[PDB]
Structures are given as structure tokens and as C-alpha cells.
């Protein structure tokens, strides 16, 4: 009786949200960006090849200096690369080799990683001893760790496969806030530029926007037909893009509270593993299961170019903070750095 | 045209490769096994004979280091993280023979044996295990023999038309699982009969992994 009545009210609320989104859907992003000229053909060459990973690479993250980056592979090795010289600055042996994510602290003093071991390990990069040591192990998630991102040296947000996201106090080792509401495994998260909000994508084909300080879900974005594997904030923080197993990439807007554009092609039938934006946001780079990395025009939903230099699934990619270069990681155990030429 | 400190950084990087190579080769000669199987399927009994989220167990048998990974605590969707094990030497699959006349605790209408058969073909025919040999364990062999006399196998398999004895009913179930192999060319299924007091459970995995190692060597050497 009471349960039946309540679940009917939920359907009415869902219809109210759908009607509200339809009310503000006066125009289409495709119509708005029809007049602007296309980016043309985007040709990028492999300037550097980072060798040394001996297994599938699952994650990489640039440092804030736009020169150092950290990558994680399932050979049980965390490697920090000097992209200018291809020198390896550090090699961090991971206690658990089944790593799925890695993060570079904005200060550059810490890195984080975690996978099927349900643990977020914090590594100190600036020690008087000259070696990287574990400073914290963040326990509390009941599923695998899918993504993690530092806000500063003391706060980090992690998404897990136990359907929850958490905000951690690194000094005390306790999760100050727990973000609940996803009905599937959360696969990725992206921090807003001001680090006051973050979005997460789960396997329930939905993306939720979370308030870091308040600790509740502000908005939920649906529209995908399969599990969401990747998510990335737009450089201004007012939008984010996702990549799913349905061979589509979608750009969601926070303020419009609905999907704006889908990035898919009929030839593409493989899942998407990673997404990132260029500094201006004009290019959306997505890694695919078909061994390629496609650079998309975010505004016009056109495939601007292809990075084809890997013999297995492109599992991760990232764009520098200054926009100078893009790194792509793949299951073929190689990292490649791309940029154009005059 | 490198400065005196840039050249020293390069020498540091080559010292890291000297240690990546040392660790990468040590990991290449070790055996990675994915331990799969359902609730009360004997999965934990096998671990009891070979002594967070994922439970990794190491053991040494005849100068060979095995890494057996138990993912029973991962309640998430299997298809998401299963690709992380693409490249394991073999998969150890535990099936309870006695769970043929029983039904699932939750469903209360789906047979336990049919659940494993659906689980087996979801793993055997998985795209990441295309050329990954599977070690199929048929546990509780002794308890199955007692239960055949009372409960006939026709409850689980209507198409069965055979003798009510262990030596014929068990072989029918054994070939039913091996029949689920949708690609009998790129992979093999190794089937073994364990028990609660057996001492040949680790030997079978050692033998089955050895045949997988030979197969992998032939591909690398170009003979295959």
C-alpha cells in the first residue's frame, strides 16, 4: 500500500524532470555550432614512445608542470616519466599489481593508485630519503577502485565499483564524506577546475554530479545504453563528457542538466575506455577497443583525427594542463606522446 | 648537446630499466591462475590444500611459482574487471557434482548445476579467454556417488537416458561441461576429479599449467 504509492510518486517526479529538460530544449547544440568552421583534419605524430611497461597499461596522469606524468600498468609498476627526455624519474613498485587508476597530485609531491584490491595507496614523491614511500593506504571501499583524483595534498576523491564515491582526509586516513546513490559500479570520476564539484559515471549508464563540501548528489545524467567507463570535466567546469561500452561518447552539461551531443560512428562498435579534453576544449580525445584513439570535435561531433600506433586496446589518455601534448596508454604496454607540426 | 646534469638524468633512467627488466623477467616465468566458481562450489576447499577485495595466494610446487587469484568477494559486474586477467596461464574452475539435484538458495527455482553450466560457458566462451586453457574441477565426487543412488540424474538432465551409476552419470556431466567449449581449436579444457582427502589436486594443476606453458612456447618460437 504505502510502498506502491511511493513508487508511483517517483515516476511522477521522473516525468517532471523529463518535462523540465524538454521545456529548456529550445535548440540543439548541432544547430548552434553549424555555422562555425570545422577543425579540418587533425594529424598528430608520435614524438616520444615511452617503453618499459611489460604488461597492459591501464591509467596515466599528467603532473601540473606539464612535463612529468605518472602511468599505471598491470606489470605491478608505477612509472613517472620525464616526457621531454623520455627519462624515467621514478619507478614505484605497487603492492597489488591489479591497478586500474593512477593520479598525480597538483603539488607534484604525491601519487595515488588502486584497483581490485579496494585500496587507495598514497606515495610520497618528495622525501629526504630520495625514494618514493607509501604514506597512506585509504581503506573503506567494498569494491574495486576505478578512479582517483587529488584535490590537494590532504584531500582526494575516489570512485569504486561498490557503487559509492568517497572524499578522503589523507592525514587521518578516514573518509570524511561518502557519496552514495549509484546503482552500479562507478568506473570514473573527474574533478572540476575549482575542486568544489566532481562528476562520476557508473555502470548503471548514469552520471551523477556531487558537491564535495555538502556531500550529496546534486544532479543525475542518464542517456547511455551501457556501462560508462570514462568521464572528464570540460575545462571551464560547466560540462563533462563520458565514454561507454555502447561505442558512443556523450557530452553532458551541468547547468542544462541533460545530454548535449553524442560522439559515435557506425564503423565504431567497440567500447570506449578513456576521455580527455584539450586546453581550449575544442578537441575531445577518446580511446577505443579497436586499437585506436580518435580525436573528436566536441562542438561538431566530427572525428577530427586518429592516433593509430598501438597493437591493443587504448586503455587511457590524457592532455597536458597547458595543452602542449597528449599521452595515450594502451594494453600493448606502450605510451605515445602526440602533437602537431606547423 | 646535453648538459652535465641532463646526461646524469639519462643514466638514472637506464638504471630504472635495469630494474624493470629484472622484475619483468621474474614476472614472466611465474604462473598466474584465475580461481573461479560459485557459492559452496568447493572454491575455498582448494585454497585450504594450497597454503580486502581480491585475495592473492602464492605457493611453490616443483620449482614453479603460482599466483592464484580469488575474486569471490568482488560482487560487482564480472564483465568489467574480468579483462584485467587477460593473460593468465590458466583458469581453475570449481564445480560441485553433488549440486545437481539442489536449487539455488535465492532463486529457489533454478538448479545449481545449470547455474554453473551457464557460468562455465560465460567464462569458457568469453572473448578475453579465447586461448586460455581452463582447469575444470568436479568437486564433491564422493558425495555425488551417494546421492545418485537416492536422487536420479534425470531430475537435472531430462535428456539423460543412462545407467544409475557413478561411472556413467559422472562422465555424462563431465562431457556436458566440455561440450560447452564453443571453440575446440584454440583452447583446451582440463578436467580433474578432486575430493576432501585428495593429494593430487595440486599435481593436476601443475601438469595442466605445464601443457599450457609448452603451448605458449610453441607460439613464441614460431612452431605453432
Amino acid at each position, epitope marked *: 500500500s504505502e510502498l506502491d504509492q511511493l513508487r508511483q510518486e517517483a515516476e511522477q517526479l521522473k516525468n517532471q524532470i523529463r518535462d523540465a529538460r524538454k521545456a529548456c530544449a529550445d535548440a540543439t547544440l548541432s544547430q548552434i555550432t553549424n555555422n562555425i568552421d570545422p577543425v579540418g583534419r587533425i594529424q598528430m605524430r608520435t614524438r616520444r614512445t615511452l617503453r618499459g611497461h611489460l604488461a597492459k597499461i591501464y591509467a596515466m596522469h599528467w603532473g601540473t608542470d606539464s612535463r612529468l606524468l605518472v602511468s599505471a600498468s598491470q606489470d605491478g609498476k608505477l612509472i613517472i616519466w620525464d616526457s621531454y627526455t623520455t*627519462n624515467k624519474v621514478h619507478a614505484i613498485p605497487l603492492r597489488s599489481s591489479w591497478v586500474m587508476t593512477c593520479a598525480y597530485a597538483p603539488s607534484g609531491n604525491y601519487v595515488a593508485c588502486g584497483g581490485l584490491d579496494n585500496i587507495c595507496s598514497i606515495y610520497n614523491l618528495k622525501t629526504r630519503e630520495g625514494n618514493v614511500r607509501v604514506s597512506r593506504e585509504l581503506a573503506g571501499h567494498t569494491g574495486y577502485l576505478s578512479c582517483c583524483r587529488f584535490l590537494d595534498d590532504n584531500q582526494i576523491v575516489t570512485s569504486s565499483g561498490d557503487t559509492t564515491c568517497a572524499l578522503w582526509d589523507i592525514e587521518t586516513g578516514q573518509q570524511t564524506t561518502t557519496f552514495t546513490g549509484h546503482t552500479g559500479d562507478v568506473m570514473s570520476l573527474s574533478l572540476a577546475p575549482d575542486t568544489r564539484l566532481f562528476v562520476s559515471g557508473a555502470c548503471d549508464a548514469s552520471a551523477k554530479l556531487w558537491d564535495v563540501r555538502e556531500g550529496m548528489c546534486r544532479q543525475t545524467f542518464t542517456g547511455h545504453e551501457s556501462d560508462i567507463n570514462a568521464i572528464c570535466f570540460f575545462p571551464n567546469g560547466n560540462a563533462f563528457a563520458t565514454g561507454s561500452d555502447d561505442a558512443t561518447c556523450r557530452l553532458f552539461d551541468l547547468r542544462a542538466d541533460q545530454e548535449l551531443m553524442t560522439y559515435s560512428h557506425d564503423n565504431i562498435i567497440c567500447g570506449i575506455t578513456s576521455v580527455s579534453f584539450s586546453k581550449s576544449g575544442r578537441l575531445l580525445l577518446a580511446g577505443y577497443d579497436d586499437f585506436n584513439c580518435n580525436v573528436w570535435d566536441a562542438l561538431k561531433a566530427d572525428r577530427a583525427g586518429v592516433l593509430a600506433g598501438h597493437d591493443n586496446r587504448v586503455s587511457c589518455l590524457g592532455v597536458t594542463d597547458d595543452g602542449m601534448a597528449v599521452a595515450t596508454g594502451s594494453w600493448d604496454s606502450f605510451l605515445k606522446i602526440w602533437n602537431g607540426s606547423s | 648537446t646535453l648538459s652535465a646534469e641532463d646526461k646524469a638524468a639519462v643514466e638514472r633512467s637506464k638504471m630504472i630499466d635495469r630494474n624493470l627488466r629484472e622484475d619483468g623477467e621474474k614476472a614472466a616465468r611465474e604462473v598466474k591462475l584465475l580461481l573461479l566458481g560459485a557459492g559452496e562450489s568447493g572454491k575455498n576447499t582448494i585454497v585450504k590444500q594450497m597454503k580486502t577485495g581480491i585475495v592473492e595466494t602464492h605457493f611453490t610446487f616443483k620449482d614453479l611459482h603460482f599466483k592464484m587469484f580469488d575474486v569471490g568477494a568482488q560482487r560487482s559486474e564480472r564483465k568489467k574487471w574480468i579483462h584485467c586477467f587477460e593473460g593468465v596461464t590458466a583458469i581453475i574452475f570449481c564445480v560441485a557434482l553433488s549440486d545437481y539435484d539442489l536449487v539455488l538458495a535465492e532463486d529457489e527455482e533454478m538448479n545449481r548445476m545449470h547455474a554453473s553450466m551457464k557460468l562455465f560457458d560465460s567464462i569458457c566462451n568469453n572473448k578475453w579467454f579465447t586461448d586460455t586453457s581452463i582447469i575444470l574441477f568436479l568437486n564433491k565426487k564422493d558425495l555425488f556417488e551417494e546421492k545418485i543412488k537416492k536422487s536420479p540424474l534425470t531430475i537435472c538432465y531430462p535428456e539423460y537416458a543412462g545407467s544409475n551409476t557413478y561411472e556413467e552419470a559422472a562422465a555424462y556431466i563431465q562431457c556436458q561441461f566440455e561440450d560447452l567449449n564453443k571453440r575446440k581449436d584454440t583452447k583446451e579444457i582440463y578436467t580433474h576429479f578432486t575430493c576432501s582427502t585428495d593429494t593430487k589436486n595440486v599435481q593436476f594443476v601443475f601438469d595442466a599449467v605445464t601443457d599450457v606453458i609448452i603451448k605458449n612456447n610453441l607460439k613464441d618460437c614460431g612452431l605453432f
Partner: single-chain antibody
Amino acid sequence: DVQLVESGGGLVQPGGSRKLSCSASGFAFSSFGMHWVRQAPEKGLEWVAYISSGSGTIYYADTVKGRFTISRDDPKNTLFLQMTSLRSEDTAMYYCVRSIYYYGSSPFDFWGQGTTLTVSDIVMTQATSSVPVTPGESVSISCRSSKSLLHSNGNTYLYWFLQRPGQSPQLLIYRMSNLASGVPDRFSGSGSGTAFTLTISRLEAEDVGVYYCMQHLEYPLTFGAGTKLEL
């Protein structure tokens, strides 16, 4: 804590041999390159030898090349300097200096206490030998180099050290602008080409001492004469 204890020094006959040891504790010794720097009595610092991380690269000063041998024992975390045919010119305090090399590292950040030995090329110029100073007043120290220290990679390999009376040298500024760990923010390094300035705002009693500028653009590493601050 990070420690570097030197031993083996003492009074030796001319033409003799002596073995200097540098024991390292509290840090990853095998990950750090090591330098020997000596200081003659009432004189400035003088670089002796260098061994790289992994022992692949070894450098010697011209005045000691062929007579001195530098070696390390990674399992024992000990650094060695084998000296032979010791002359009266070798009477000095020998300092053990650690230096690690990667992007953004701070070489020469920690120095040892030094050991005393008694026996019975880019030119770095610090013309101003002494500067009378008072606490709380701003002081600028100038350094000159015969060659331009700016490399094509954008780095300017100039280092500043402070040796307080009775104490080991301490790193202040590395690569001509960066501030070393544990050094107060009042120190600031500014320079261009061959002329460099070290600005010390709100000078304090601890800042009193001799300041040395060293170049790391190329080997051999050469030191300036040194600028002394006195009250």
C-alpha cells in the same frame, strides 16, 4: 635522520697515502650521486671527484686525476676516496656531498661534516672578500663566471652555498633561482648570463657566514673565492 660521517683523516707524511670514507645513513645511498669537495685551511671549497648513480660515470679533478680514486659500496652504504702520493697541497677538510639527478631535483642539498687531512676550467670570481653587515638589513652578493652558465635547456646551473663558522656548507639556491629544502624564504637568487646576485631580505644572525657560488654547467666543477659576511 640524514647523516654523513667522514673518517680516515689525520696527519700524514708527504708522498704518503690515505683512505677517506663517507658512511651514509637515513637515505637511499644507491640512488644518489656522490661528490667529494675539499676546503684548504683559510681557503675556499675545491671539488675533488664525482661518481654517478649506478657507478657508471666517474670524474676527477685535474689537480688530483691519476692520484685519487673514488669508489662506493652500495650494500654497505659507504663512499670511498682512495688518495695516494699525498702532497702538502692536499692538506684540507674533505666534505662528502650527496647529489641526486632527475627533473626538478635539488643536487648538493646535503653536505657531510667533513674530515681533516694534514700533510707534514670555468673561472668563478667573487671579488668582494668581505662585507660588513648588520642584522635586519638587506644584503646582495655578486658572483661572476668566465663562461655563460645558461644551457640550451633553459636551466642556469649556478649554486649558492653558506658555510657558517664551525659548520658544514649548506645549500641555499640550486639552479640559480630555486630555494633548497629547509632554507628560509628570505634568500632569493637572481642572475643573468655570467652575472648573478643573491638577495637576502631581513638578514639575521644565522645568515652570518661565507657564501660560495659554484657552477654545475659542466665538469670540472669550480668554486668562487667566497664572500664573507661579518658583523
